[PDB]
Each structure stands twice: as C-alpha cells, then as structure tokens.
Amino acid sequence: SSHKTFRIKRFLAKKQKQNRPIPQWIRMKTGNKIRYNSKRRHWRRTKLGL
Amino acid sequence: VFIVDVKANKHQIKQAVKKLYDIDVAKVNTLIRPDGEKKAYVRLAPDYDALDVANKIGII
Amino acid sequence: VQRLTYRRRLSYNTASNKTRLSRTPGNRIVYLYTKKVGKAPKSACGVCPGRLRGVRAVRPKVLMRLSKTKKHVSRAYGGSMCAKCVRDRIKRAFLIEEQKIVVKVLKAQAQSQK
RNA sequence: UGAACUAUGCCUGGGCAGGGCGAAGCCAGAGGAAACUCUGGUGGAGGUCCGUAGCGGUCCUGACGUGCAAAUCGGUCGUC
RNA sequence: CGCCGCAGGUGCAGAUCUUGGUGGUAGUAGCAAAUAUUCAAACGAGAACUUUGAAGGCCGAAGUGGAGAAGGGUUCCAUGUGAACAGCAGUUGAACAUGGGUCAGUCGGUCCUGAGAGAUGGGCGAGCGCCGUUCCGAAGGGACGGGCGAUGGCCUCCGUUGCCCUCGGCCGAUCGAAAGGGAGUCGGGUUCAGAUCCCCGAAUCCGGAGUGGCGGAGAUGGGCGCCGCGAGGCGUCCAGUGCGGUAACGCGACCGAUCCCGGAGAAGCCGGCGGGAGCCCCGGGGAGAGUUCUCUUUUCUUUGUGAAGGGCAGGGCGCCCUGGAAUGGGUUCGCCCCGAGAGAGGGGCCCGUGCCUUGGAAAGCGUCGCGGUUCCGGCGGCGUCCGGUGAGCUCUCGCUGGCCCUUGAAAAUCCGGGGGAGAGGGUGUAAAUCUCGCGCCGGGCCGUACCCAUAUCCGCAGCAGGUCUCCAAGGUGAACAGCCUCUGGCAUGUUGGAACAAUGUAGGUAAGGGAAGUCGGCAAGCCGGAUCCGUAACUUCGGGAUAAGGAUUGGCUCUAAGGGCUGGGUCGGUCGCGGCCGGCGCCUAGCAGCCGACUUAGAACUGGUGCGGACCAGGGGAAUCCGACUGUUUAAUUAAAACAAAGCAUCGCGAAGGCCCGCGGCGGGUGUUGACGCGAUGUGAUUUCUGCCCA
RNA sequence: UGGGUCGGGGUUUCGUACGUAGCAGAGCAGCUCCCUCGCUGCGAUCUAUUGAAAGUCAGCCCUCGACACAAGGGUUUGU
RNA sequence: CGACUCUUAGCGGUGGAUCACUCGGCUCGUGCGUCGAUGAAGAACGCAGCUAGCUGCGAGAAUUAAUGUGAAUUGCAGGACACAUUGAUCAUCGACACUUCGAACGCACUUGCGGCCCCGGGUUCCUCCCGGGGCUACGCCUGUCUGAGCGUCGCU
Ligand SMILES: [Mg+2]
Ligand SMILES: [Mg+2]
Ligand SMILES: [Mg+2]
Ligand SMILES: [Mg+2]
Ligand SMILES: [Mg+2]
Ligand SMILES: [Mg+2]
Ligand SMILES: [Mg+2]
Ligand SMILES: [Mg+2]
Ligand SMILES: [Mg+2]
Ligand SMILES: [Mg+2]
Ligand SMILES: [Mg+2]
Ligand SMILES: [Mg+2]
Ligand SMILES: [Mg+2]
Ligand SMILES: [Mg+2]
Ligand SMILES: [Mg+2]
Ligand SMILES: [Mg+2]
Ligand SMILES: [Mg+2]
Ligand SMILES: [Mg+2]
Ligand SMILES: [Mg+2]
Ligand SMILES: [Mg+2]
Ligand SMILES: [Mg+2]
Ligand SMILES: [Mg+2]
Ligand SMILES: [Mg+2]
Ligand SMILES: [Mg+2]
Ligand SMILES: [Mg+2]
Ligand SMILES: [Mg+2]
Ligand SMILES: [Mg+2]
Ligand SMILES: [Mg+2]
Ligand SMILES: [Mg+2]
Ligand SMILES: [Mg+2]
Ligand SMILES: [Mg+2]
Ligand SMILES: [Mg+2]
Ligand SMILES: [Mg+2]
Ligand SMILES: [Mg+2]
Ligand SMILES: [Mg+2]
Ligand SMILES: [Mg+2]
Ligand SMILES: [Mg+2]
Ligand SMILES: [Mg+2]
Ligand SMILES: [Mg+2]
Ligand SMILES: [Mg+2]
Ligand SMILES: [Mg+2]
Ligand SMILES: [Mg+2]
Ligand SMILES: [Mg+2]
Ligand SMILES: [Mg+2]
Ligand SMILES: [Mg+2]
Ligand SMILES: [Mg+2]
Ligand SMILES: [Mg+2]
Ligand SMILES: [Mg+2]
Ligand SMILES: [Mg+2]
Ligand SMILES: [Mg+2]
Ligand SMILES: [Zn+2]
C-alpha cells in the first residue's frame, strides 16, 4: 500500500536492488559456469514473502 | 540535491552541508528513495547561488 | 457537472472526514475539511437544560488560545453556572442561614427552664 | 501451527431509491333530550406491503459440465 | 579383458511400479458471456489489431468516469529492442534493457484509550513456565511553598545544589485504532513522471525567550497647607490587584498557589419541518463556436474569489426588563406554550459555511492579436454582467417529535468557576502581574510514485468469481427503475475472413382447438401503470384487499380553480414643484399594479378504436395438509413441514450457594449479578382444553 | 456476338409523400382612420395536387436505351 | 502411373540411455575436544571502479595493522609495486576495529518516546533548541549508605 513502515520499505528496496541481470563481463571470467541470474523475480509471477 | 546517510536527520544534514561547503542553507527537505538511499533537497540562502556552489563542488 | 474527490487518504464518511464545498478563485469547486461544531458549556447546576450565554462555542482545545473574556461572564460562577441558579443559590444560602439563626434563638429561649 | 475462509460474542466505523396501507395523538362539522355517536381532515406507527442497491439463492431439475469457474452464468425468484 | 580364487546393492515385460523421454489421438477439440465496426494517412521489411484524423456505436453519473483503504512493490515515467511472453498478430505492452521519479510544524503515523492483550507483587508449577491485573506489595523518586545551610555568579540580587518540614490515591507498568478521540494550510503556478509537501502569495497552531523585546493595562486620583495674577507647579497625608449595564451581559488586558466543583472531549436509530450552500432550471447582456435547402433576435460552450480577520444579513435561544392574561389567548405540517408569567413592546447571547470588505486581480479563465529566449509564470487589448424561480437533488446547520424489558464508549487533552494561602509599592513617571497589540527564534523521525481491478490484489493465469468506500448532469418518469443523451472513457472483452447445412444455445411467431401433453400446467403465455367506480366468504376485527369485477387513457385547442409581493389618504392651511403638524376624508361586501411554480377538473375538435403505443409493470378464484407470523438453516445436490421465536409449564439456587471451566492456587465464568435474577429443561402465537395411571 | 452494370417498362407491396394552396379547421393572441364582415399570426387534423410517394431480385418478368468489358490466365492428360 | 500404409536399410532429426571421467558423498578410524552480558548462535541491512547470486567483510566494510613470503591480481580498466631511508600477491593471524535486531539490557515496537551527567554551537550561563559522548534491564552474593518496626532491650 501507500502506507508502509520503514522496515517494509527497506526490505522491498533490497529485493528491488537484487532483481537485476548479471553483468556481461561476468561470463568472461575464468571458470565462470554462470549464464543468467536464476533468482530473477517478476512482480506478477512470484510474490514476495512479506 | 544530495544523497545522504539514511540515519542522518535534517539538522545533521544542514550542519554538514554548512560546514563542508562553507554555505548557508535555508531549509532541507528529505525523502528516502525506493532503493533505500536518503535524498536531501537543500535550499540555499538567498545570498548564495546554488549554481556557483555546484560549480565549485564540480557537479555541473 | 464537475464531480469531486477527497483531498486526503481518509476515504470513509466518518465524523472526522466532513467537508463543505468551496469555489476557489480558479473557478473550481473543491472540498474544504471543516472543524467539528463546538458546544457552549452546560450549567454546573445540572438542572436547567440550556447552555450558557456569553461564551463562545468552540472545540475544547481552542479554548487554550482564546482570551479570558471570551470564556466567562462577569459574575460569580460566570461561565460555569447560569444566572437563574446563581440567584437561587444566593437566596437559598441566605435563607438557610436565617433558619439556623431561628433554631438557635428558639433553643436559647427554651433553655430558660430546668 | 492455524479464526487471512467460515461460526459466535465484544469494540470502533460505514450503508440501505421510489411508492402502498394508514396505528395512537389532534382539529372541525353533523346528529341527539342526554349518554354519546357519526363524518371529513390532520398525523405518520409497524420485526407492515410492492419494489431498487445490498444481502440471499426458489425453479428452469436452463446454460456449462476436460467449464469463464475445483460451484460460475442467464432468466425467474426470497427479503429489502 | 582372459584364466584360478574371493565378495556382492549381480540379470526384468509386467507391480493402476519410480523418474525421464516420446507417440497415435491431431493440425483435432477448440480460440462463440456482456450490440460494432469502417475509411484515409503516417511510421515501418511487414498493419484486421500501433498512432493521428474522419465516421458509426457503446458505458449512460448505482459508469467501461474521477479519486482513495487493504493488498501488490516499481507494475509509475521516458528512451530503445523485437529473442522468449502477451493461447491470432503487433511497429504495441503491466514484456525485455537502460536511465529517472515519491520533498510536509499545519495529510497521516506518532499521542489517547476501546474490546482486549500483558509484566511486577503474590500464588501455583518436576520444569519450560502460567494463573492473575488489584488481587496476599513498605507499589507516591514529584511539588510554585518554608527552613537548615554550602554563596557555586554581573558573590547588589535572583537563579543553582544537598538535607529537612509540609502537601501529594488515575489504586497501578506497558501495549492496543493509517475508519473512534486528537491544536493548527489555503489559493495560484509548475513535471515525462511529485506536490494541500516544490515555487510564488497569503495565513495559522504549538513550544521557547535567563540577562526581561517594544508598547498598552495595572496606574497614576482625593484632601489639606502652599507658591503662583491665574493656569500650572510645591510639600504633607490618604486611596488605588480595571470599568460599564436594572438585567440578560459587555469592554483589550483585568494578580493569585496547594485544594475543591463543573464543563467540553462525550455520543443511538427513525420521522417531519425550516435556514444556508453546491448542482439543476428560466429570462436577458457579452465572447467564441454550430445550423442556415427554408425557418429560427436561434442552438451549444463559457461568463471566479481560498484560508484567516472586520462589518452586516440570516437562523436559533428553556436568556433578560416592563406588564399581568377567560369573552382565554398565542401557535405548528404535526404539535405545543402560558399567574412556576401568555400575547405585546424593548433588549441580551450563540452560530454565522451567506453577502460586502482586507486578501483581490497583480492571479485564474474566455476571447482577439503581436513579439520571441530551438520548449518566455512573455507582451498587449477587451471581458469576467444583470436578474428570477423551487414539496427539485446532494451536503450542512437547526428546530421539534417518535422508538426501546435496546438508553446507544473511554481516555488523553483543554477550559471555566469556588476559595484566598500568598505576592507586590509608598505616591513613584511606581511594583508584583497581564489569557491585550505587535515583534524574535524553532518544529526532529517515518510514510507519500502507481494500480485499486472484466489486466498492477486473492483465486496456479491479463480467470465471466471474490474484494471496504467518496463525487454523481439533461430528458421521460413516482423514482439512485428501465430506455436515450452531455462531461469523461472505451474498442466489444485471449483471433480474423467467407458462408448460412444438420444438431444445439438464446430469442420470437404461429391458423383451428385449448392441457387432449406430462408424474405434475414444468416451460411459456395471460395479467400488469395511473384515474374513476366497485369489492365476498371468513376473521384474532387489525385484516382479507391491488380481493373478485367494470370503465377510461393519444394528439390538439381552450376554460376554470388553486399564490406571492407592493400601493389604499380629504387638503400650497405652505417652502424644508419637495418636507415637520393640523380645520382637513371614509377603501372597513376590498381593490389597483406587477410577478411566479406546477397541479387538478371540465369542454370542444381530431386520427384506419389507436393511445400506461417503447420502457417500466400483480394472472385470478375455491379448498385440503403443515408451520402461527417476521427470522434462520446443510458454503459445493435437501430452504422444508426442519431450527428459532413470543407465549405456556416445570426444575435448581439466599452466595460456606446453583450451573459451569480449570493440571494447579479459596484460581475462574454467570457476576459491574441477587429470585421481576441467574442456571437447566420441555412445548411452541392467539382461542380452547390438557383425561386416567407412582405398579 | 455475348454476358454483365445502370436505366426504362411490367408485376407486386404498402397506402395517398415533401412542398404548395384552401373564406377547411375546436379555438386562441394581436390590428380596427383601416374594417362593414373584415386582416395578421399559432393551431392537431382535413381537402386538392396524389391509387400518390417509396421499395421491388439480391434466386421476379421483358428490354435492345446507356456504359464499360469480353481468343484471357494456370495445371495436366497418348493407344 | 502416383498417393497412402507396412517392412528393411543409408542418412538426417528428436531424445539423453550407455560408456569413460569425478575438487562430491557414505562408511570406518585417529587427535583434539574450544560459545555467550568483554554481548553467542541466529537474523537484518549494508560494503567492490565496473558486481545480481555465491563467497568474504562491517561505516577502517570482497577488508586495516603485524608477521612469513617474495612479483603479481586479472574478465576489462586503472594506478601502483627503487623488492634497501622495505615490498605486488598470497598465507598466517597475536594488534586494532567490529552497523541494527537478537539472552538483548532506559521504556516500546508491524510505531515511537524518555530521564540523568558531561562537551561543543545558537546561547552570549540561565536555561531553551541542535549535535557529540557516557549512563539508565532482571535476578542475585559480599560490602556501603540511607532507612522502617505498639520486634527485643538499655539510658534519660
Ligand atoms: Mg496475482
Ligand atoms: Mg517526509
Ligand atoms: Mg465564499
Ligand atoms: Mg476475520
Ligand atoms: Mg418489512
Ligand atoms: Mg416484502
Ligand atoms: Mg442443470
Ligand atoms: Mg538389486
Ligand atoms: Mg521396463
Ligand atoms: Mg514376470
Ligand atoms: Mg476446428
Ligand atoms: Mg469458436
Ligand atoms: Mg447508450
Ligand atoms: Mg474508478
Ligand atoms: Mg501470440
Ligand atoms: Mg506504462
Ligand atoms: Mg520489467
Ligand atoms: Mg498510589
Ligand atoms: Mg498506544
Ligand atoms: Mg482518526
Ligand atoms: Mg499524480
Ligand atoms: Mg472577493
Ligand atoms: Mg411574550
Ligand atoms: Mg484578468
Ligand atoms: Mg498518490
Ligand atoms: Mg476478473
Ligand atoms: Mg497462491
Ligand atoms: Mg481480460
Ligand atoms: Mg460481440
Ligand atoms: Mg475484437
Ligand atoms: Mg395456435
Ligand atoms: Mg387460436
Ligand atoms: Mg392428462
Ligand atoms: Mg397421456
Ligand atoms: Mg412457471
Ligand atoms: Mg382472495
Ligand atoms: Mg380525447
Ligand atoms: Mg414458517
Ligand atoms: Mg399455531
Ligand atoms: Mg443460508
Ligand atoms: Mg446445499
Ligand atoms: Mg438449494
Ligand atoms: Mg399455545
Ligand atoms: Mg421457550
Ligand atoms: Mg399423581
Ligand atoms: Mg429495374
Ligand atoms: Mg539418428
Ligand atoms: Mg598488511
Ligand atoms: Mg501505535
Ligand atoms: Mg524499639
Ligand atoms: Zn441552572
């Protein structure tokens, strides 16, 4: 809602900041084995815990 | 417009800006951004030009 | 017709969400949130049902910033008791004290016999 | 571990077109020898009636029945 | 890997076996709930679907509109992409990628308590702990007052500190509401996205000020001796914690503590009236548009003044003074009121959201132009006017009623009064003090974007489901009905094209007959609004009842009836073609002028008997059974005759108690209770009865 | 020569169009040097023009009027 | 003549069996056998030039110091780094530091609000506003101070 507490807002901010693609230079590292961020969360598909 | 520590209040922001930029400020408005960083709108006193201050800071 | 919206996040028609229509200089109708209707003091006699005269009817916390004259009447018990019941209390006090003197005189004259 | 659904109590809020009938109380007139009666108004009661919104869910044993839906939809309906 | 030995988690077709993959079905079912699209152009490789324009439609203010709560959490906003996703496509996207965006003393949270939750003391408990919330506590850590002192210093003198005296029950921590209570912010502008928060301009609340910021108030008079021509000054005394009105009460302040009293906060549902506003409607005047085949001085749009002050209307008063009323009077839609003081006259107070005014026209808006700063709060002109109506709608304020075996919070917080402990100065250009005017400083923390739903929430999903609210135009009409339209919105609900077979789903019609169909009139049909008539049995006398039954209804042209405001003067007898008093006259069966809503009744004329022309909108009657009624019920097959109910009857109980909970505590619920009450049963309104049997 | 598309005519359906005019019309509002029974409006409806108007093959009938188009395209086939 | 269907084979798809591999497990054994109010375990939020996860770390934040080592780190960039008036990286780890919750400690939390003592500023000492620092939980032992009792006594 518009009314939210500071803890809820900060939790949402962290979940926002970690919902981004991997940097492209990561895949050039030695022995990477990572292709794409598998922890991507879309707002409509998967809902947050809180 | 500044990005400030989320734990700093308006008085602290005002005093910090005054001390480390040698300017006098009129008021401070404060919000916390959706990414969690605090943003401060610091209006300067009428006898200080925010354009010149931003030029000295180097953010033009 | 131009329809209206609430200007605050309270969306329910509660007793603290009461409005009136205002026409701004911009020729638009907006809501103005009104204050509650105040009440004049009731009399401390607790008998007659009318509310006191000479006193502004405002919300209780507004009385802090009113001057003294606006809150009381220039009389004994002024602003706390009605004039009629003040008159009644004056007469009642005087006459009951007179009756006390009567019984005092009566026993003083009756004690003359052993 | 659960009363975010539901059941019940409590607290604090919000809400319910338009019509019909016409309870007490009241006014006047008329008839009577009286007792009293009759008549016309006024009034606006009620777990009152018709009927929206709301709430419910009668029948079609209608639709659908690998559905729009793990109970929904249409008309007709109960209360309002 | 062979051979000799050794050791096994050692051999699969099955177990509706486990996991993974793949077929036929099958290019099949299907992409059919809510009326609907079309033309041109642009961009583009590509257009039924994107964008612009034009047209035709829909939602039709109880919206497919504009905003919120909860929930979501970046979906918001730009730019770009065209992998996958958006069950067709896409140049589009709530997708993907990159950036950006939420600004507060006065909007909330925060504070208060509510139902309740919950520590401590105590009690229990093997124990984690749990019971309990004033109960079995030494539960006040505070206070202007006074004293004892340290003088800490601008040691004059008042603020400081320690101790003592006196006073001191929220008698219970703490938590509990983004809808309860709760001081104080509005107008204009501004963005791609934020604004009651930014900017501009106007306010306002609370808090503070020790050295006291300025004023004003307190408060500056009276007597006597004098001086002095007098005025005006001098000196000794004396007052002085304001003043007015008969009153209601008023004035700009108007000393005062502990303590006590009271008020406000602080109250339900419903009815009927009245005031105010916004909206709607009517008549003109402007400005801009539309029509002009013909007519229409026409039709549409538009035509402001916030908060906070001041004044004045208007509304209300169970407020005062005079006076004393029956031949009772006043008065409401209803009522109701009066020797406990009517009517009448004169005042007082409250609310004042209305009008005028400061704000304020400088802004805003509409128009007509001229300059540009690639995208100026540009410049300029003109205007922003005058009226009328009302059972109209919606808010609001008030008055007066009704209902209740129902009586409809609490606490923060603020204020008034009673009392008078004290304080302040010796007549000074004075003191204590001041709720008066102005001035100075400050108001931290968190939330704030967007969606709020036939696509941003929950239902596995862009799911016909569910999900709390506020605003609410014109016509018809009884109407927030249905139907059409304006503002605003949309693209037909996850595809299009071509046909028009059966069978379906939804909707109609049907000659003659009229339930012969069927378990059964299921389904459909009939009736339907309003006006005028007229209505039975039965009945608990209230009902039945819209019983039943009959007539009428259009259009046009009139006619009557139903109102409100003003003015009713006989005269130059004179001069403030006008005014102070009087010889000077009889509307007293009331007129004269103007203005304005609908509604009713009657009549004529008229149409191919059609007229509640769509929409809205009861089929009716005679009985039997059951349940009295209204109410409730098996969410997802049973709405009933079942449950409930009032009424009736019985039982237990006087608190060391009845009934009940509890592992436990003399723990807890009924119980903030007390036999007209609690608890436990049966039957089920009314009426009428309720027989016999205690083996 | 052809079949189309318009047009025309026929058939048929409904029922008498718009406009104009009338000393038609219940009446009503204005003008009376006017008028001598008059003149200007509003007025449902009526009468004439007018068995008119409109539709009619899209799966009706006949045209010999007008207009343009019609040796054209593609895929196959042998005892 | 072809289609279609079936069988077989070549090739190509779909699929991921088999085999080979193995910085993982499972089992046994050994030696130690160590948390915490000096604030644990656990949780939250942050921290990199480009960094989402994992890992590491704590506002000194993919780490400081110190010691050992001895020329790298690396995906890109950048700049170091005389390797002796000392040094990249890594390892070790004894110095320093270590945000917020949490036994979690001023009171309370899905929010927020205090009190006391110092220091600095606006004040221009007097107490208001701002900032900084230190305290302010419960139980309990020893001692200390202040006390209470018509508890038991002494003296007056
Ligand atoms: Mg969802
Ligand atoms: Mg803020
Ligand atoms: Mg106004
Ligand atoms: Mg619930
Ligand atoms: Mg009812
Ligand atoms: Mg009903
Ligand atoms: Mg069925
Ligand atoms: Mg095996
Ligand atoms: Mg097998
Ligand atoms: Mg076998
Ligand atoms: Mg198909
Ligand atoms: Mg289909
Ligand atoms: Mg419509
Ligand atoms: Mg909406
Ligand atoms: Mg698709
Ligand atoms: Mg968007
Ligand atoms: Mg995205
Ligand atoms: Mg106490
Ligand atoms: Mg609280
Ligand atoms: Mg509130
Ligand atoms: Mg917005
Ligand atoms: Mg004005
Ligand atoms: Mg009177
Ligand atoms: Mg102007
Ligand atoms: Mg918003
Ligand atoms: Mg839906
Ligand atoms: Mg789920
Ligand atoms: Mg949809
Ligand atoms: Mg459709
Ligand atoms: Mg479509
Ligand atoms: Mg038939
Ligand atoms: Mg028939
Ligand atoms: Mg039969
Ligand atoms: Mg038969
Ligand atoms: Mg039926
Ligand atoms: Mg009947
Ligand atoms: Mg007629
Ligand atoms: Mg029943
Ligand atoms: Mg019965
Ligand atoms: Mg039910
Ligand atoms: Mg059921
Ligand atoms: Mg059922
Ligand atoms: Mg009975
Ligand atoms: Mg009973
Ligand atoms: Mg017996
Ligand atoms: Mg023809
Ligand atoms: Mg193969
Ligand atoms: Mg080092
Ligand atoms: Mg709270
Ligand atoms: Mg003793
Ligand atoms: Zn009284």
Collapse the DSSP code of A33 into the 3-class scheme (helix H, G, I; strand E, B; otherwise coil) and give the result.
coil
| Token output for B39 | 């943003």
> Which candidate, C68, C66, C65, C89, places its Cα nearest to that of C77?
C89
Resolution (angstroms) equals: 2.6
In 3D, which of B10, B44, B40 has the Cα closest to residue B26? B44
Report the C-alpha gap between C49 and B13 in whole angstroms: 58
Q: Look up residue C12 and give its amino acid.
A: Y
Residues C73 and C55 sit within 8 Å (Cβ to Cβ): yes
Cα separation, C22 vs C28, whole angstroms: 8
Residue ranges of the alpha helices (H) in chain C? 83-110
How would you write chain B as a 3-class SS string? CEEECCCCCHHHHHHHHHHHHCCCEEEEEEEECCCCCEEEEEEECCCCCHHHHHHHHCCC
- How far away, in angstroms, is C9 Cα from ligand 27 center? 30
Residues 6 or more apart whose Cβ sits within 8 Å of residue B53: B21, B23, B44
Residue tagged 């009381």 (tokens) = C72
Dist. CA B37–CA B6, nearest whole Å: 6
Contacts of A12 (CB under 8 A, 6+ apart): A4, A48, A50, B34
What number of other Cβ atoms are within 10 A of residue B26's Cβ?
Answer: 11
Burial B33-51, CB ≥16 within 10 A → b, else e: eeeeebebebebeeebeee
Interface contacts (A, B; CB < 8 Å): 15
Q: Is C72 exposed, middle or buried (0-12, 13-18, 19+ CB in 10 A)?
A: middle
Displacement of CA C84 from its chain's centroid (Å): 15
Which ligand is closest in space to the CA of residue C16?
Answer: 20
Strand pairing class (B38-44; C19-23): unpaired
> What is the whole-number distance in angstroms between the Cα of residue A39 and the centre of ligand 17?
14
Q: Check if residue C5 sits with its Cβ under 7 angstroms from strand E.
A: yes
User: In terms of C-beta density within 10 A (0-12 exposed, 13-18 middle, 19 or more buried), how is residue C81 classed?
Assistant: buried
Chain B positions touching A17 (Cβ under 8 A) are: 35-36
Q: C-alpha angle B54/B35/B51, rounded to 5°?
A: 10
Q: Which residues touch strand D (CB under 7 A)?
A: C 12-15
Instruction: Specify the long-range contacts of residues C48-54, CB closer than 8 Å, at least 24 apart.
Output: C48/C82, C48/C84, C48/C85, C50/C82, C52/C79, C52/C80, C52/C82, C54/C78, C54/C79
